[model samples]
Target: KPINVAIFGSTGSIGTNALNIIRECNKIENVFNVKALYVNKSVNELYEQAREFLPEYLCIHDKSVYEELKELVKNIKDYKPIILCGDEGMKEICSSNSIDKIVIGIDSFQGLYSTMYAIMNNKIVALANKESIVSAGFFLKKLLNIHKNAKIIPVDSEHSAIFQCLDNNKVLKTKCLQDNFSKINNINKIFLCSSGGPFQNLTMDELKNVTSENALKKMGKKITIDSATMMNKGLEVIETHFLFDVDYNDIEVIVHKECIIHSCVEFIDKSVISQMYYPDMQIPILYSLTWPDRIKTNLKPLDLAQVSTLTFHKPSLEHFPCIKLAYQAGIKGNFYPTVLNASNEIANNLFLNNKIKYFDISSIISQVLESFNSQKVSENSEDLMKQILQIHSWAKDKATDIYNKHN
Candidate 1:
C-alpha cells in the first residue's frame, strides 16, 4: 500500500523539504500520496503547493484568509480539495483517517494541540516542532502508551542522527526511544553536534552590538539567535533527556563547525556510532519518512575523502548563558521547561523587533524563570496539557512585562 502523508506547516523549511522528498521519491517507488496540506498564513505558497500536489484536503490557520485561499484552491485543476480553517480545522486534518503520517513543521506553541490530536488518533508523526516535546514530553509518552500504533519520528538532524545510531547499533537496538525515554539504558551517552552559529568566533564586545540582520547571514534569524545563545543546544539537551532518557551530564555537546557529523552515540564498552551527511535537512527529513528501510534519493552522496579533517571542541556557557538556563529549566522539571520555552519565545520576538539587545534574550528568560513560582505548578501527568498551556501563558505574560519594564 502507498503511504498517505500530510504536510503541516506546508510552506516552511521542513514541510517544503518533505514535499520535495515525496516528489522526488515518487518518481522512483511512488510510495507516498500527498493526503493533505496545511499552513498558517502562506496562502500564495499554499495555492502553488495545492496546485502541484493536489492533496485531498487543505487547511489554513488564519480564518480571515479562508475565502482568499478558497478562491485560490478553485484554480487547482482536477481537484476539489476539502478546505479547513482555524485550530479546530488543523486538529480535524491531523486526525483524518486518510492521513497515515503527518510531518509536523508548525512553529511555536500553536502546533501542540495538533500534535496531541495526531497521537490520540494513532497517526505516525514526523515531529519537527521541538517545543511540543520540550513542553510536555511526559504527557506525550503516556499518551503513546495507550495508543501503541502511534509513533513520533524526529525530523531534527541531531535527534534523527541519534535515532539512527541507536537503531543501527547491535547493542542498542532501541527504536524511537525518543518517544520512549525509559529505554536509554543501552547506551553510555549521546553526543549532539552544534554549528555554533555566526557568533561562534565573535568576541564579547562584538556580540553585544550584534543585530538580528547580522545573524541572518548564516541561517534564519531565530535559530541563529538560538545557536548564538546556545539555547538551541540547550533545548535539544532537554529534548535528548526525554527522548533518550539520559542524564543531563551524560548527554554531551561539542562544536563541530563543518556540521559534517550530525550526532554520535557512545556505548558502555567505549565503542562509538555516528551518523554523518552533508549539512542538508532533506537527508533527515527523508529518513523520518522511511525509517528502518533506506530509500534511494537524488541528492549527492557524502564524499569523505575530499574533506581533510573533522574538528570538535567544547562550548563556553559563560559566553552563551541560554544553555545554562535551559539546563536549569530541564533539571527543575515540570513547568520550568514550559516557562523556559515561553519566555524565550517572547524574548526572541522582542530582540528581533529591536526592543532588546542580543544578550537580553537570555537575560529576560532568566529573569522570567526566577520570577515564576515554578514549584506551585503541578507536574502530574493527568493535567499535563492544561498545566503546559497555563504555564506557557503565565511565562509569556511575565516575559512581556519584564521586557516592558526593561525597555
Candidate 2:
C-alpha cells in the first residue's frame, strides 16, 4: 500500500526538497506513489516535475496564464495528466481520496484555504508554510477536532525538532498532540533557535545601508528581510503557540550563531533535550515524509567533534522590533495574529521591491496593528474565519497606505 502523496507548491524550496526525498526513497511501487503536483506559475519546473513524477493530476493557480501552461505541458512527449487551474482546483486535489498525504509548501497566506481543505479531507499534512498556521491556527484546531485522522507534521526545522523531542519522550499521545498541552507532564519550556541571518552582527548604522541585492545574496528575499527584522522568528513564535499549545512566555527565541542546534525543550527536572543537525532542510523534510519510521538517506550525518563553541544570546527587542510586535499580536489574541501576518507580508514585499527601507518594514506593520487594535474581534470559531479574511485584507490595505505615507 503505497502512500499516495500530493505536493502543493512543488516548484518552491521545501517542495523541491520533499520531491528529492521521495525520489531518493525510490517510490518503490507500494511504498510511495506520486499522486499530484501543483505550482503557482512556474510552468517549466512544473512540466519537468510532471514528466518525472508522472502524477495523476497537475494544477496551476494563475488562471489567466493557465492556458499557456496547458499548451506548454502538452509539448512534453507522452505525458498527459489531468490539468486543473485556480484555487478551487487546488482544493479539489487536496480533497481527493487518492491522496493519503499532502506536502503543503505553498507560500504565505495563499495556503490557508488549501490547508483547511486538506484537513477537512483528513489527509496527513506535511506543513512547511508559516503564514497559514500563524494566521488561523484557531480555525485549524477546530478542523482537526472534526477530522480525528487528519494531522500535521511540521516541516520547519525548529518545530520538527520539538516534535521529535516530544515523540522520543513518549509524551506525544495523539496525532493532534499540540492540543494536549496539559499532558506535557514534566516539560517546562521550549527554545526555538535562530541563525540570526546575515545581518545578525550588523550595527544599527550598517543595517540602514543594506540593499535588496545584498539581502538576496544572503537568503530568499522575503525571509532574508524577515531574518533582518527577526519577523521570521516572530511568526514562528505564533506558530509555536498553536502547534504545541505552549504559551508565549514559555516559548523563548534564542540567537544561536552556529545553526547546529535546531531547537530544544526543558523538562521540570531541568534536563534539556535538543535535536542537533547540520542545518539541512532535507533532514526535516524527509523526517516528515517517513515519520515514526526512519529510513536510510544519502544525507551526511553531522560531525560534532570539529564544531566548537556553540553560543546563545538573548534577542534584543530594540534591535529587532518585529519580535516585540509578534509577541504583542499573540498576546492580543482574536484576529491580531492575522493582522500581524498580513501586514508583515505586505511590508516584506515592499521592502523586497525597494519601495521602502528595511527599517520602514516594521514601522508599517506597527502602524497597521495600531489602526486595528480597537476593532471588535469575533470570538466564535465558525464566525472567526470570515473575520480573519476581512482583517487580513484590511491590514494589508492599511500596511500599503502606511508604506506609501513613509515613502
Candidate 3:
C-alpha cells in the first residue's frame, strides 16, 4: 500500500528536512508518498515545492498571501491540488479524508488543534512541534488514551531518547509502601539532558547583554534565544511529564553541555537507561519518520572516538529562570500553560526584533502567567479554543507593554 504523507510547514526548517527524507524514500520506490504539503508564507517556495512534489493539496497558513499563491498556482489547476489558506484551512487539511499520515512541523502552539484532530482521526502523526503537547498535556493524553490507533512518533531528539530509553523492560519504582510498589511501579526519576544552549556557562548579568547577533553566531537565533531563556529545557521538562505520565516532582533536568547523551531514565533498582548519539537532529528525525522500522539513509551516525569527554553540570536556575517559568506553567495546568506558550511566542518575537533583552523573553511570560491565573479553564474543545484565543490576545498586550517599558 502506498503511504499518503501530509507535511505541515512544508518550507520551514523541519518541513524542508522532512521533504528531503521523503525524497530519499522515493529513491526506494513505493514505501512512502508525499500526497500533500502545507506551509506558512513563502509562496514562491511553496510554488516550487508544488511543482516538484505534485501533492494533492497545499495549504498556506498566512491568509495575507493567499491571493498571490492562488494566482501563482492558477496554471497548475490540472493537478487539482486543493490550495487552502488561514489557520482554519490548516485544520481542514488535517481533517481531510485523503491524508493518512501527518508530519507536524509547524512552529507554534496552534498546531495542537490539527495534531489532536489528526490523531483522533486515527492517523499516524510524526510530531516535531513540541508546544502542542506542552500546552495541552492532559487533553492530548486523553485523546491518545481513547484512540488506540493514534501514534505520535517523536521527531525531537530529547523525546526520541526518552521514548527509546523507556522502551526497555526495566521496571520503575513506585510511591506508597511495598504493596503500592508491587501494584504500580513508578520511575525513580527521569533525567533530561540538555546542550545548555550557547550561554551554558554565562552569568545572569552576562546573559542580559547577550545580543541575538552574538548569540546566533554560537547557537543560531531561534535556538540561542531559547537557550538563554532556558525555554528549550523547560519544554523538554513539560514534554517529559506528558510522555511518561509522571508527576512534575519525579522529573529532573541536568545540564549536559556535551549534547551527546540525549536523556536518561532511572528505575528503583539503580538501573538507568540513557540514549546516546551525535548531537545532530537528523538522527531523531529519521528515527521518528521510520519508527519501529529503521530505514537506511545517507545520514551519519554518532562516533564517540571524535570527542575526548562529554561534560555534565547543573543548570543555572537563577541565571536562566525561564525554565522555571515554564515549569510553573505546566504544573498549574489548563489556562496557565496556554498563556505561557502564547506569551513566550510573543516574547521570542520581541527579542528577535531587538525590542527587548534576552532575559525579557521569559520575564514577559512570567508576567502573563501572573495575569492569566485568574482566568477559568474550559472543559471541552470549544472552551479550550476560546481560552487559547483569549490567552493570545492577553499575551500580545503584555508583550507590547513589556517591550515599551524595557526597550
Cα-based lDDT for every prediction: 0.82, 0.83, 0.73
Q: What lDDT tens digits, residue by residue, belong to model 1 across residues 231-329?
A: 889999888887777777788889899999999988777789999988988878888777756888888888998876899988887778888899898
Question: Model 2: what TM-score?
Answer: 0.91
Could you tell me the lDDT of residue 381 within candidate 2? 61
lDDT, residue 307, model 2: 86
Candidate 3 has which clashing residue pairs, if any? 173-186
Backbone clash pairs for candidate 2 read none
- What lDDT is reached at residue 239 by model 1? 82
Q: 1-407, model 3: which lDDT tens digit per residue?
A: 66678888888778888788777766866566787788878999999989888888888877899889888987775577778887677778778777778988877676776787787787778887777777666566656666766767777778788666653232223211112322244357788888777787777678888877655663346656776567878887777676665667777888888788998878778688889977766667666666655676755666788866888887878877888887898788666666776688788777777778887777787777887654665667556656667676777787678667766
Off by over 4 Å in 1: 168-185, 376-382
RMSD of 3: 4.7
Highest-lDDT candidate: 2
lDDT: which is higher, 1 or 2? 2
Model 3, 159: alpha-carbon shift in Å?
A: 0.8
Cα RMSD (Å) per model?
2.4, 2.6, 4.7
Q: What is the Cα-based lDDT of residue 177 in candidate 1?
A: 36
Q: Which of candidates 1 and 2 is the stronger one according to TM-score? A: 1
Q: Give the CA lDDT, 0 to 100, for residue 231 in model 3.
A: 87
